[PDB]
């Protein structure tokens, strides 16, 4: 029902999974997709293929709101980081800019122990 | 006595009363004895990042030469004055009178 022309895509790329969510400015959510919910369950989840699958699904879901110019914010490591933006651009959005918003502590909390594997 | 440099950020809304507060500070310093070596008002500035949910700040600079008691008094005055956010007090040797950059 509600129509918004401007939107923002958040891409939570990580070692195990990638999550795509479309939010109108002020951060209210419209649509979202994940790799795990689109097959590729297991080691396949982290591949960029699942990332682009999720990105296209989220974009197609979000087209209903009639938004054509999109801002992109990226945080975290992991494959599929660029596949998501490629898929979003392919869907037809106008990507205004891509920025890295991954958090960085200035020596805060103690990280977990190293794994003896 | 020693030499001190004071930078004060004042809330933009209460920028009208800045002349009065600084005048009171100078009067107190002179009453103690002291020496006012430098004084400027940089005006209001756009903050690099928000401080206490505010985006603008009035800026005042002073070089004074006073004693420990006067310094301590200035300290709690700045602490308790709500108009003053973000005060800073640096120690210096010698008095610098030359006009500062960023004056206007």
């Amino acid at each position: 029902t509600r129509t918004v022309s401007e939107g923002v895509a958040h891409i939570h790329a990580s070692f195990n999974n990638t999550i795509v969510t479309i939010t109108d400015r002020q951060g209210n959510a419209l649509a979202w997709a994940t790799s795990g919910g689109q097959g590729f369950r297991g080691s396949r989840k982290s591949t960029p293929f699942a990332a682009q699958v999720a990105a296209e699904v989220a974009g197609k879901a979000a087209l209903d709101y009639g938004l054509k110019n999109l801002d992109v914010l990226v945080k975290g490591p992991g494959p599929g980081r660029e596949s998501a933006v490629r898929a979003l651009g392919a869907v037809g959005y106008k990507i205004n800019s891509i920025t890295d918003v991954t958090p960085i502590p200035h020596n805060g909390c103690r990280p977990p122990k190293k794994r003896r594997v | 006595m020693r030499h001190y440099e004071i930078v004060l950020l004042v809330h933009p809304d209460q920028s009208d009363q800045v002349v009065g507060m600084v005048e009171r500070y100078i009067s107190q310093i002179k009453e103690a004895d002291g020496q006012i070596h430098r004084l400027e008002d940089w005006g209001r500035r756009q903050l690099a990042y928000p401080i206490n949910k505010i985006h603008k700040a009035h800026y005042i600079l002073m070089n004074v030469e006073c004693g420990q008691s006067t310094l301590d008094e200035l300290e709690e005055l700045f602490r308790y004055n709500d108009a003053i956010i973000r005060n800073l007090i640096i120690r210096r040797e010698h008095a610098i009178t030359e006009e500062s950059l960023l004056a206007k």
Binding site: - | L47, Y49, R86
Partner: protein, 52 residues
Amino acid sequence: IDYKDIDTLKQYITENGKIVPSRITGTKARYQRQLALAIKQARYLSLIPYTD
């Protein structure tokens, strides 16, 4: 260097706001130390951004 010389302070800061290493610029050791102190003072005084 003083915290009030914002132009030179920015001349040694990267776009993200991080301080540029001395090796890249050729600055001397003591000059680099005073530069870092001045940049930190300016960051406190909200004359230059901490990050971003």
